[PDB]
Amino acid sequence: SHKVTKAHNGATLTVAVGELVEIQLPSNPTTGFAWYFEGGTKESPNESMFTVENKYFPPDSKLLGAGGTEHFHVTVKAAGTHAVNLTYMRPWTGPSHDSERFTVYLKAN
Amino acid sequence: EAPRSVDWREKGYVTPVKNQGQCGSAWAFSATGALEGQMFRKTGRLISLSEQNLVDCSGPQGNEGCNGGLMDYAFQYVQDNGGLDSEESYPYEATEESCKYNPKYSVANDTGFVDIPKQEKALMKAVATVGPISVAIDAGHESFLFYKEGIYFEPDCSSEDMDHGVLVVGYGFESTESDNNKYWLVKNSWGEEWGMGGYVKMAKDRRNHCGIASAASYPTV
Ligand SMILES: *[C@H]1O[C@H](CO)[C@@H](O[C@@H]2O[C@H](CO)[C@@H](O)[C@H](O)[C@H]2NC(C)=O)[C@H](O)[C@H]1NC(C)=O
Ligand SMILES: [Cl-]
Ligand code: NA
């Protein structure tokens, strides 16, 4: 009902409370990198506002080191304009100005 | 037969930890690591080898640069190509580029490769007798990205579906732990800042944990 990819960086989706939004982003943990909320977490900044589930999907490949995909399942729990802000980084190194970022806003009335 | 512990770093077989960066080229680091070790056994000279040479040039053998590859394909390339350049002569760029192999700067060769039987007992004998061994593991878990020290054990690891090429430089056991306390000493290619100076102690004799014995090999020189 709501799917979002890199093509939708910076977009706003209007959703109902309790509705699920699926975010799919390229991700390659074999390079040490993954997507995180600020502070290197996969969890929501505010659980009462929205919840997040995260899962990695390896590619179908006979090779080692092909890129896969991370899915973030976000469920909005209250009225608001919920900012989902992710950064692609090696967690032990942290972010820089150059790091790739993804943002979507989930707006519930 | 084999020793209770082995560590080829202490014998001069192993170059410092390298960094693949944001590129799916660990297969190339695993291959140069194994070849570095066998060349050292042969000549007594440890010379860092070019991962970029493998990334740029081994497409005909089946490799896909920053989108993945296999150590065995890298070993076949070195054989077909009649050589492999030094790290110094052909430095690492972390991107796929045109092939710039120059035979004048070749410092290694191989005559083929040997694949280890899919058992931790066989892997232990190869490590003990041959030197550092190229292996594939299931590295696709956040616990691996966050690894700092101690023996790595991930309950959700697969023995069958591996995605990352690394190098086994030895094995041993933790004095402190006491039931399942054995490990493989594994060189990663994520820089010195990851793990134990770039290394991970992967659980050993815990039912082929993370598939470490499932696709192991080394080059013949
Ligand atoms: C590894 O590969 C080749 C094949 O043996 C070596 O090239 C040969 O070297 C011998 C001995 O010097 C010469 O007699 C031949 O003319 C060479 N044959 C060739 C070029 O096909 C090569 O020197 C070796 N490379 C390294 C880095 O040791
Ligand atoms: Cl890829
Ligand atoms: Na695969």
Residues 6+ apart with CB under 8 A from B139: A29, A30, B162, B163, B164, B166, B210
Distance from CA of A58 to the nearest CA of B (A): 7
| Ordered domains of chain A (ranges, CATH) | 1-109 (2.60.40.2020)
Question: What is the extent of the structural domain holding B44?
Answer: 1-221
CB-based contact B113:B72 (threshold 8 Å): yes
| 3-state DSSP assignment of residue A71 | strand
Domain count, chain B: 1
Residue B124, classed as helix, strand or coil, is: helix
Which residues in B lie closer than 8 A to residue A64 (C-beta atoms)? 24, 26-27, 68-70, 136, 162-165
In this structure, what CATH number is given to the domain that contains residue B78? 3.90.70.10
Q: Could you say which of A31, A56, A91 has the minimum Cβ distance to residue B24?
A: A31
| Burial readout A42-67 (b: 16 or more C-beta within 10 A, e: otherwise) | bebeeeebbebebebebbeeebbbbb
Q: How many CA atoms lie within 13 A of B197 on its CB side?
A: 5
Q: Which of B102, B106, B107 to mutate to test the pocket of ligand 1 (most atoms within 8 A of CB)?
A: B106
Annotated resolution, angstroms = 1.8
The pairs formed by B152-158 with CB atoms below 8 angstroms and a separation of 24 or more are B152/B183, B152/B200, B152/B201, B152/B202, B152/B203, B153/B180, B153/B203, B153/B206, B153/B209, B154/B209, B154/B210, B157/B209, B157/B210, B157/B211, B158/B210, B158/B211
Other C-beta atoms closer than 10 Å to the C-beta of B140 total 26
